Amino acid sequence: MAYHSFLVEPISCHAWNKDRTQIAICPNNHEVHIYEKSGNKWVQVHELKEHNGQVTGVDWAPDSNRIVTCGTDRNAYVWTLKGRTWKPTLVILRINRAARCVRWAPNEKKFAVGSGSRVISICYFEQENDWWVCKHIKKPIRSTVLSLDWHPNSVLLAAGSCDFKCRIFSAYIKEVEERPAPTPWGSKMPFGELMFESSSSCGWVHGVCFSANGSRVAWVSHDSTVCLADADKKMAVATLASETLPLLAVTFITESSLVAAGHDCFPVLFTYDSAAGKLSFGGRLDVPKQSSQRGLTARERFQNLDKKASSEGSAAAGAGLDSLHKNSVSQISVLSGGKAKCSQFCTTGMDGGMSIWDVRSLESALKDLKIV
């Protein structure tokens, strides 16, 4: 539908209040300002610096307005809007070097973590610490986390790892929780325990996503496998890999269809039923925000006496990609109507612009799944 870069930030991540208004960002280096949806304009709203480890992910609990901040320092905190600014409120961990990603136990109980230090620093709040504290899954794990997904019952967890082996786990903490419901994958559910695995060490698992209720789960590696486990097919599994350029992201948008995106910058559809290994695509989804009438012959002349990239090609219509797809696209999300009835969706890029998109033109089908 629509786009603009009000200023050209390398938007390395994005996050919000649940009304998708105040855009927080991972910036260049260690320098954040939050901007906001000024109608559809974008205008500065905050300056943040005191999580000094650049930025990585966050988990902005978006109702309660609690950005658990992460990155290359243990000055990692719930940033909360203190009315004045988003400002730190410390977490204690036993990770080292960094935190890449962080993840509320969905009922906001606590969060899960991905360390610069092989580990899940399972972190839990203490009023007594005035802050969080942690305990550690240094083993039976071997290496650390890039992506995270709690199963909806919120004490049950999935992750994508630099330990590769596509494993399902439990991480209950006695001093904040009680152990979860008999998980069909595996139901030994204390701290640090392993429910199930798919033998896939097949690339470092890079995206993890439950279906609309998590009855099945998808995965992808950055080595660009695309994969699943389904419990009701009796702990069944599936795997595939794409044709196209290597993955930035994937999400379910139902229990049977998913959106994927890679270094091709355009999104592509995926589709499925319940035929175990029958992973299937659905083709490219977007249409460009450009048309062929672009040009300015005077500057084309001036800078054909000078010669910087001065032999033309439609690669340049996407600053090298074509499709207006730039130096690169950098993220995707649904705006509204959700993983069932989406009304709008959006994407970020190295260009620093908001973009929002043509959804319901593709609404043109009914029902899913087949027990195969």
Partner 1 sequence: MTATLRPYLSAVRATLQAALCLENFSSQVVERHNKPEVEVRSSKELLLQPVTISRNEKEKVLIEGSINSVRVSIAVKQADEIEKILCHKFMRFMMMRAENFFILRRKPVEGYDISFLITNFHTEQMYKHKLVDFVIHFMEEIDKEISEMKLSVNARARIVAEEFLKNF
Partner 2 sequence: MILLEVNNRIIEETLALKFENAAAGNKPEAVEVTFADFDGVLYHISNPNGDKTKVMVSISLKFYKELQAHGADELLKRVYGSYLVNPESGYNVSLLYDLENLPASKDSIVHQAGMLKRNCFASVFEKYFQFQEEGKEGENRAVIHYRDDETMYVESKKDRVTVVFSTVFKDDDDVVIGKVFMQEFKEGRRASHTAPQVLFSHREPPLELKDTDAAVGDNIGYITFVLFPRHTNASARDNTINLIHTFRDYLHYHIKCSKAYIHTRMRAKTSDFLKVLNRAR
Partner 3 sequence: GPDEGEVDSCLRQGNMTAALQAALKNPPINTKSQAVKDRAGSIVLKVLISFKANDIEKAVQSLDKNGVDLLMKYIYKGFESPSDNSSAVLLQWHEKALAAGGVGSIVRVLTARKTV
Give the residues lining the site for partner 1 (CB under 8 A). 10, 72, 97-98, 115-118, 143-144, 162, 164, 201, 203-204, 222, 244-246, 263, 265, 309, 313, 315-316, 318-322, 325-328, 350
Nearer to partner 2, 293 or 311 (CB): 311
Q: How far apart (Å, rounded) are the C-alpha atoms in residues 298 and 350?
A: 28
Could you say whether residue 73 binds partner 3 (CB under 8 A)? Answer: no
DSSP strand pairing (2-4 vs 354-357) = antiparallel
Question: Using CB under 8 A, which of 309, 340, 362, 372 touches partner 2?
Answer: 309
Gap between the Cα atoms of 177 and 179, Å rounded: 7
- Of 89, 201, 254, 290, the residue at the interface with partner 3 (CB under 8 A) is 201
Residue 244 tokens, joined: 């196209």
Which residue among 225, 330, 348, 355 contacts partner 3 (CB under 8 A)?
A: 225
**Closest CB to partner 1 among residues 115, 211:** 115
Nearest CA to 53 out of 8, 93, 18 is that of 93
Amino acid at 128: E
- Token pair of 236 as six digits: 């069944």
Q: Does 241 bind partner 3 (CB under 8 A)?
A: yes
Partner interacting with residue 162 (select from partner 1, partner 3, partner 2, none; CB below 5-8 Å by kind)? partner 1
Token digits of residue 192: 């640090």
From the CB of 263, what's the least distance to partner 2, in Å?
Answer: 16
Question: Measured from the CB atom, is 222 or 289 closer to partner 3?
Answer: 222
Q: Positive or negative, the Cα torsion across 284, 285, 288, 292?
A: positive
- Please name which of 255, 270, 281 lies closest in space to residue 339, comparing C-alpha atoms: 255
Contact 144, 117 (CB under 8 A): yes
Interface with partner 2 (CB under 8 A), residue from 307, 363, 364, 366: 307
**Which spans of this chain sit near partner 3 (rule: CB under 8 A)?**
201-203, 223-225, 241-244, 246
